[PDB]
């Protein structure tokens, strides 16, 4: 399809450092694949989102509780396919 | 000339003249069909592998020769009565003997394979000496000569790879046919041979500098060149700014004027052989050093040639700075930590960078009364006039050249991995069966072949390199550090066979000990 | 000289000197034993077939060598080397070399095939250099070397048609006993070799005409020949006959005195590629193109080198005017547009008519008061003196030589299919297994043998045909149009395998690139 | 646009010799034209009708009375172009 794979689905971040990486940059294809899209579905507010329209994460500021971002790519021809990650963030 | 003659003897030696070494080995080969004589194209669109990952190539039913490790040379006696005293080895000139082909022809008749001696297949073999093909070796692969004299390899497959779009193909990708070479039958009597001279490369360097760079002057006298050593004069009170220079040094060292500077530097990752002190995430691909090159990222690995860690920090390695040997009992796939060989390179502390540590600060803004001096920190840094390096170490595993690709322009061309950079290396010299075919049907028919007889070869192999070595010429007093074995009652010897006959290396062995002054 | 040792090497090579191009190709055969080995005749009376497809001959077990195709000389590369900077090339010589035979015999004991090497058996190769035999090459069959040199092939067997009153046999058809010819007994350690030279035959013209024939006049200045410009004074009224001449032209060019002629015409059938506009008939065969030769009725099929269409027709195409090769998944019966390669043939409309157009209109009638001048329509046009044409474009599948037929006159002796018309052509070499008999009887019999071993030869046939090139001397400013590969991110490279490797040829490859003024 | 132009607009056809040509060949452009089209507008029934769809006219079995046809030129790109021809057929 365009198949998407995050880097895991599972993290678990120390407090009170909040700086973590999601890799969504294994993602295969059997051709190239146009751009990476990154979104979010759970989590409060007040981040620093940088780049959602690019391959590897440069996550910052992260309240402890559950954050829940999506990965969804796109093939050339189109197809999507969007693979959420979990952010477990404990002190 | 045979049938009832061997068309060759088995050389194996080693000897040492005064100012070079002739190293021949003779191994015993077997070469099988590949593809069933087919030119299949490999890509990456059947698998499905990731954006960095995706590939177009083809994959030929040739068979490739690769002496490119130097124990494929050098028996570990012979590696160690070059490195004890040599400082500088490169080669002369090879010459490469293919004989006492013998090609037999399986039949898996009824689940039973009987094994028969066929005496008029052929064997195709040329050496391709005008670089018209991909030069797949210097790639570190396998498939070379084995280490141990008395084991029987089996000859690798030569495929390559062209441009991609993907897994797409570009009208640049380029496709070789390697039967519109002039290749060599070869019979059951006939012999390959031929010769090559290297070029005039640089000696290997097999030699530690026993100077550092930022300590090459004489501990006694002071230099007659001031600098800056105090912008805020102590009255006791608080800032006054009076720009006090003085002389130095013979003991403030580190502020001196230098002469000369470091190597260049790309930062690795400082990453601990102790599970325990090493961050939770994965890592690596997430904090690694990466170049992009065609839109797609490549770890660099080993990158350029720098120290493996700083003073007594022997459990840091960086995480693509090291070469990494597998023993055996490692698989190919998520090996641990013990059936690895990490090459510790620490040789080269004096000139070169650490592979983790910044290449110095440089200075942001400009300091005045209002803004404070910021510096930032340095981590990548191409080369200044005025920097000297020593490229990597070579070992008994690693590869001994490279092919420096035929571009416009390329600077210092010695490989990553250590080695000689040749712009016209050891030719490739390809091998194959030619193809038998089955019994055709009694009408004529368009479509090419379905079926043809199963067959491989065998035969030997000889491989005779003669070395050119830099004798040294020290006066150092104190003994040097040579490389030992372990004098102890051992369960074990070391670099021999074991109770079933298994040769197992089994620690890398480098090439500098030896010591001449910066 | 065998049986331990090779006959011959692998020759594949493809050398670009200045005014010569030697093209050498290497092949592995395979002969299998044909008609059990008997001089069987065919002829339609066993099949039945139509009245204009009868025929009468025989069917030797001999097998020939048939390199009467561009492919099996010209890789892609060459091919398309040659044809971007060439005016024209010629052959001067061929080198035919047939080697490293092994004679292995097949014993199917028991359902199952066990191949065994035979080393006493024999191969009889002659060539035959004073042709004697009829010419079966330039047929346009299969059985050729492969286009890709990685192919085992297998020979076509040599059968010959004679003269017939239907499916009888006339009193001058001749049966031709190939045992006696000299034939050269081949054992597995011997080979065959000859050498030929081609005639002055004239260059292949692999240019196109940057001028038409129609358009050789000084655009600027009008000539001095007058002509009939009107038969009819216009004063507003009626007809008056004034018989008007004037002077042209230096825009009126369709009325002008030429100097020359376009070629012979023999029109072909407008066919449409668009399956929607032609006739709901069938047509071939009603409607086609054919002559009578001793009652029966043959397609011209390509006829006379003419255009394929007019300019921007590319969906039209003459129904039997065009070479039309197969792709792979092509069976030999009913097969539809897309696995088929009608070759266009367009460089030739300056000089060439159109095979799908009339040649002009003649006049019927005497004009006068009475009469009107009534034209009649040109169709099929024999040769004019002062008519200028060019010949059928040559292609990388299509063939390359045929012979003239040894008769008492001849026009133009090109070949209709394209190619060099030859007097004395490359000679067949026919190859046949020696028939090894198995057990006779103890006592004597007088018929002849119904029991051979089984058997069949492999080996490998080398031919390195010179070619003549003639370099171009243009001097045309703007760019040419040339040859050139689709450089696109591609699922596959042109003219290379598979992923379970195929050669696939993709598209006919003409020589008309170049310009040259006519 | 297409400029077309018939060959005489105006003919005279004496019986019982019923045989003409209307000429709209030269029927200029600055591209090629790629049909010429025929069409009819006056006349009876009853006449071969030969290739409409052509360049010269080939008419026969032609009524002494007044018969009209229309030439129409197509351009590429298309442009059509309507010139007329009148055919005083007289005994």
Redesign the interface.
Same mark, same amino acid.
């Given at each position: 399809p365009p198949?998407a794979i995050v %880097?895991?689905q599972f993290?678990?971040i120390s407090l009170p450092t909040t700086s &973590? *990486?999601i890799?969504g %940059?294994?993602? &295969?294809?059997? #051709?190239?694949?146009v751009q990476y899209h990154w979104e979010e579905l759970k989590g409060p507010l007040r981040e620093e989102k940088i780049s959602e329209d690019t391959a590897?994460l440069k996550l910052s500021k992260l309240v402890p509780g559950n954050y829940t971002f999506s990965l969804t790519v796109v093939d050339s021809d189109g197809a999507t396919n969007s693979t959420t990650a979990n952010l477990t963030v404990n002190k | 000339?045979? *049938?009832?003659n061997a068309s060759g003897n088995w050389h194996c030696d080693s000897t040492w003249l005064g100012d070079r070494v002739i190293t021949t080995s003779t191994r015993t080969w077997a070469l099988p069909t590949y593809?069933n004589?087919?030119?299949?194209?490999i890509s990456?669109? %059947?698998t499905?592998? %990731?954006? #960095?990952?995706?590939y177009f190539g083809?994959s030929t039913?040739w068979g490739y020769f690769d002496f490119n490790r130097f124990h494929c040379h050098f028996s570990p006696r012979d590696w160690q009565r070059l490195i004890n005293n040599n400082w500088g080895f490169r080669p002369k000139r090879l010459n490469f003997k293919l004989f006492n082909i013998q090609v037999k022809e399986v039949?898996t008749? #009824?689940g039973v394979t009987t094994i028969a001696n066929?005496?008029?297949?052929?064997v195709?073999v040329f050496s391709d000496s005008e670089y018209q093909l991909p030069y797949v070796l210097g790639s570190a692969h396998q498939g070379c000569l084995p280490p141990f004299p008395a084991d029987v390899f089996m000859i690798p497959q030569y495929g390559y790879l062209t441009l991609?779009?993907?897994?797409?193909? *570009?009208?640049?990708?380029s =496709?070789y046919?390697?039967?519109? =070479?002039?290749?060599?039958?070869?019979?059951?009597?006939?012999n390959f041979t031929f010769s090559y001279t290297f070029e005039e490369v640089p000696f290997h360097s097999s030699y530690a500098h026993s100077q550092s760079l930022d300590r090459l002057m004489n501990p006694l006298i002071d230099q007659y060149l001031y600098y800056l050593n105090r912008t805020q004069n102590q009255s006791g009170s608080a800032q006054n700014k009076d720009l006090l220079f003085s002389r130095g040094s013979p003991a403030g060292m580190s502020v001196q004027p230098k002469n000369w500077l470091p190597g260049p530097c790309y930062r690795q990752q400082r990453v601990s052989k102790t599970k325990t002190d090493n961050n939770?995430?994965?890592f690596t691909?997430?904090?690694a050093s990466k170049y992009n090159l065609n839109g797609r990222?490549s770890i660099i690995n080993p990158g350029t040639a720098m120290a493996s860690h700083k003073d007594d920090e022997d459990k840091f390695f960086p995480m693509s700075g090291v070469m990494i040997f597998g023993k055996e009992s490692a698989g190919a796939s998520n090996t641990a930590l013990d059936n690895v060989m990490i090459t510790d390179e620490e040789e080269i502390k004096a000139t070169n960078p650490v592979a983790t540590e910044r290449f110095g600060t440089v200075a942001v803004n400009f300091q005045s009364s209002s803004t404070d001096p910021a510096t930032g920190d340095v981590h990548a840094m191409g080369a200044l006039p005025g920097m000297v390096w020593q490229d990597r170490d070579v070992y008994l595993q690693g590869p001994i050249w490279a092919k420096i690709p035929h571009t416009d322009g390329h600077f210092h061309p010695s490989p990553l991995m250590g080695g000689f950079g040749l712009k016209n290396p050891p030719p490739q010299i390809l091998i194959k069966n030619? !193809?038998? !075919?089955?019994?055709? !049907?009694?009408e004529?028919?368009?479509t090419? =072949?379905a079926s =043809?007889?199963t067959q491989y070869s065998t035969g030997q192999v000889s491989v005779e390199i003669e070395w050119e070595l830099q004798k040294e010429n020290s006066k150092r007093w104190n003994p040097e550090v040579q490389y030992t074995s372990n004098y102890a009652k051992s369960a074990n010897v070391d670099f021999t066979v074991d109770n079933n006959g298994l040769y197992t290396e089994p620690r890398p062995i480098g090439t500098r000990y030896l010591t001449r002054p910066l």
């Amino acid at each position: 399809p365009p198949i998407a794979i995050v %880097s895991p689905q599972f993290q678990e971040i120390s407090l009170p450092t909040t700086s &973590t *990486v999601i890799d969504g %940059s294994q993602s &295969t294809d059997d #051709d190239k694949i146009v751009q990476y899209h990154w979104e979010e579905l759970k989590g409060p507010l007040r981040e620093e989102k940088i780049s959602e329209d690019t391959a590897i994460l440069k996550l910052s500021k992260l309240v402890p509780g559950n954050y829940t971002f999506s990965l969804t790519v796109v093939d050339s021809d189109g197809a999507t396919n969007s693979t959420t990650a979990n952010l477990t963030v404990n002190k | 000339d045979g *049938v009832g003659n061997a068309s060759g003897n088995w050389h194996c030696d080693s000897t040492w003249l005064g100012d070079r070494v002739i190293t021949t080995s003779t191994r015993t080969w077997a070469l099988p069909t590949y593809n069933n004589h087919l030119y299949k194209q490999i890509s990456s669109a %059947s698998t499905g592998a %990731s954006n #960095d990952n995706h590939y177009f190539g083809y994959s030929t039913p040739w068979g490739y020769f690769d002496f490119n490790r130097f124990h494929c040379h050098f028996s570990p006696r012979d590696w160690q009565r070059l490195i004890n005293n040599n400082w500088g080895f490169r080669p002369k000139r090879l010459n490469f003997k293919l004989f006492n082909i013998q090609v037999k022809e399986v039949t898996t008749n #009824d689940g039973v394979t009987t094994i028969a001696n066929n005496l008029t297949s052929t064997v195709q073999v040329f050496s391709d000496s005008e670089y018209q093909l991909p030069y797949v070796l210097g790639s570190a692969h396998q498939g070379c000569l084995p280490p141990f004299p008395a084991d029987v390899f089996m000859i690798p497959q030569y495929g390559y790879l062209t441009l991609n779009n993907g897994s797409q193909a *570009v009208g640049r990708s380029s =496709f070789y046919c390697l039967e519109y =070479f002039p290749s060599q039958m070869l019979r059951t009597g006939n012999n390959f041979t031929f010769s090559y001279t290297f070029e005039e490369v640089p000696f290997h360097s097999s030699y530690a500098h026993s100077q550092s760079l930022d300590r090459l002057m004489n501990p006694l006298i002071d230099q007659y060149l001031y600098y800056l050593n105090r912008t805020q004069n102590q009255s006791g009170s608080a800032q006054n700014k009076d720009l006090l220079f003085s002389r130095g040094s013979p003991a403030g060292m580190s502020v001196q004027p230098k002469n000369w500077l470091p190597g260049p530097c790309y930062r690795q990752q400082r990453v601990s052989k102790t599970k325990t002190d090493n961050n939770n995430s994965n890592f690596t691909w997430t904090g690694a050093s990466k170049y992009n090159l065609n839109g797609r990222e490549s770890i660099i690995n080993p990158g350029t040639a720098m120290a493996s860690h700083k003073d007594d920090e022997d459990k840091f390695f960086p995480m693509s700075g090291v070469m990494i040997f597998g023993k055996e009992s490692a698989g190919a796939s998520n090996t641990a930590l013990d059936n690895v060989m990490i090459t510790d390179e620490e040789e080269i502390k004096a000139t070169n960078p650490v592979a983790t540590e910044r290449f110095g600060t440089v200075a942001v803004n400009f300091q005045s009364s209002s803004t404070d001096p910021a510096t930032g920190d340095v981590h990548a840094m191409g080369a200044l006039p005025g920097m000297v390096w020593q490229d990597r170490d070579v070992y008994l595993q690693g590869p001994i050249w490279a092919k420096i690709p035929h571009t416009d322009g390329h600077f210092h061309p010695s490989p990553l991995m250590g080695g000689f950079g040749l712009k016209n290396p050891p030719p490739q010299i390809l091998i194959k069966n030619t !193809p038998v !075919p089955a019994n055709p !049907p009694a009408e004529f028919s368009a479509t090419k =072949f379905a079926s =043809f007889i199963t067959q491989y070869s065998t035969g030997q192999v000889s491989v005779e390199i003669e070395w050119e070595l830099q004798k040294e010429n020290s006066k150092r007093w104190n003994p040097e550090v040579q490389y030992t074995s372990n004098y102890a009652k051992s369960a074990n010897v070391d670099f021999t066979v074991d109770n079933n006959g298994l040769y197992t290396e089994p620690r890398p062995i480098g090439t500098r000990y030896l010591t001449r002054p910066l």
